[PDB]
Amino acid sequence: QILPPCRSIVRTLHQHKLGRASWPSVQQGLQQSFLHTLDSYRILQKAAPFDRRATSLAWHPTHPSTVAVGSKGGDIMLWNFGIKDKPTFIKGIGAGGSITGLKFNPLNTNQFYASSMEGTTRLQDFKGNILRVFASSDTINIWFCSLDVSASSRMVVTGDNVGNVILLNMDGKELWNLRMHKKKVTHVALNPCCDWFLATASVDQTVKIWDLRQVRGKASFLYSLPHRHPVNAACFSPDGARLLTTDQKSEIRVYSASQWDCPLGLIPHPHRHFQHLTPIKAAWHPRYNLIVVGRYPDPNFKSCTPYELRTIDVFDGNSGKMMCQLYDPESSGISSLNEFNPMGDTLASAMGYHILIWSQEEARTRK
DNA sequence: ATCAATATCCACCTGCAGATTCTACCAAAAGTGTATTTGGAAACTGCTCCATCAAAAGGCATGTTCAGCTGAACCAGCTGAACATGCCTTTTGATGGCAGTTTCCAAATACACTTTTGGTAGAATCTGCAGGTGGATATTGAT
């Protein structure tokens, strides 16, 4: 395979110590170094099963080794590494209560937000106590699909199966529930560097950029970006300037700050949507300009590589092409969800009925 | 090699809680009941040729009876191939979003009933003939 990297590494660091070379060149060199050491994540560290399929994933923001996960049957799990304290569990109905959105609480880490097929955007503890419901369908067969949160703004946002989005405060205060789309809202997210423009994606083959404080007039939006197929995810950058989008058939798109309408590059990659599989969500890496996605081969997709395996692919953002591929037998499932740690030293993967941890090996000999 | 105790097996019967689904109120709306009246379809009546009932009888083609005799049914048996049957593998099948069809609803369109004319394509009617139709004779293909 490819993975060639080269450079005059330490020199640049000293160049940075002299002021000659600019910081983005440093960021590029250490991005390459990060890829080189990610070539040693090949040894899969840990595996974890449980009951009904995995649907949503989330990282403990402050802690590297802690992670939370939510199932197809409303079964939530909280798991920490190097603890061995037999991780924490909570069950649900198990049939039609699929948790589908899951973000940690920025305030109380022993709390968590959740969006469920039951029709209940809730705030609940890992010990089982429901602290507070935020919204409700009040009529079954109409449920939520999307959820996200912001701490700098102290806001909650959630999306439906019909095309209307809801926006609440941390203490209630609902001033929202206007309709935005014609179909289900697959993903949604707020800017981390801003507080008052939003992004939402839907089955309508359109992804919309809103201004949550200015617009109130039922599709008096700010921007609307089209696509050729429906969209499973539209995720913001940490920096805030790059919006990543991933469709259902075969595509990834990078939109910029600079003219949201036009895209900067198209990254073709197979992640074909499917009914009983968990929907695929590309994701950023929090401290570089990389992209990470899970692959799902299609015999009809125009493959550039002659070898098409199920594996975790890692591309470069501002170029378009690939830079690394992680693969491990005994894990021949399809990695629906993949998310790097906010810390930057660990990767979590959610496959059907399985959760995988990929971190570096070392510790050749103890003393 | 039998019927007659027992090991084991499995249909039946029971008990109990859960799942399926029979049973049972209220709203929506196609669908069903009165009602008079018309003109096309049943029923009535004659008749009368055309089709059939009857039936007599006179050979004779055809049906009935007996002989006798070899090909057909059936049976003891019965090798060995063909296939049930368990017991383990292996393995494939049951359950667990969306696009692509299928379904309404108004408008716009196709085209098929309607009704008379009239000549004409086609059936009733008969008039000549040749392709059967029957008998008589010569070769042969099965015996």
Give the DSSP letter of residue A360. Answer: P
Q: Indicate yes or no: strand B within 7 A of the C-beta of A141.
A: no
State which amino acid sits at residue A160. Answer: D
Resolution in A: 4.1
Distance of CA A363 to the CA centre of its chain: 31
From the number of C-beta atoms within 10 Å of its C-beta (0-12, 13-18, 19+), residue A17 rates as exposed
CA of A96 and C1' of B13: distance in angstroms?
40
**Residue A183: CB less than 7 A from any atom in strand B:** yes
Coil, helix or strand at residue A24: helix
Asked if the Cβ of residue A36 lies within 7 A of any atom of strand B, the reply is no
Give nucleotides in strand B with any atom < 7 A to a protein C-beta: 96-99
Residues 198-227 of A with CB under 7 A from strand B: 203
User: How distant is the alpha carbon of residue A195 from its chain centre?
Assistant: 19
A125-160: string of b/e by CB count within 10 Å (b at 16+)? ebeeeeeeebbeeeeeeebbbbbbbbeebebbbbbb
The kind and range of the H/E element at A15 are helix A9-18
- Experimental approach was cryo-EM
Distance between CA atoms of residues A52 and A117, nearest Å? 14
- Residue A188 phi/psi, 5-degree rounding, is -165, 150
Rounded distance in angstroms from the CA atom of residue A339 to the C1' atom of nucleotide B35? 81
Asked whether residue A272's C-beta has any atom of DNA/RNA strand B within 7 A, the reply is no
Task: Find which nucleotide's C1' atom is closest to A94's CA.
Answer: B96
Instruction: Identify the residues numbered 83 to 122 in chain A whose C-beta atom is closer than 7 Å to any atom of strand B.
Output: 95, 98
Query: Residue A279, CA: closest nucleotide via C1'?
Result: B97
Distance CA A337, CA A294 (A): 7
Determine the straight-line distance between the first and last CA of chain A, rounded to whole angstroms: 37
Question: What's the residue count for chain A?
Answer: 367
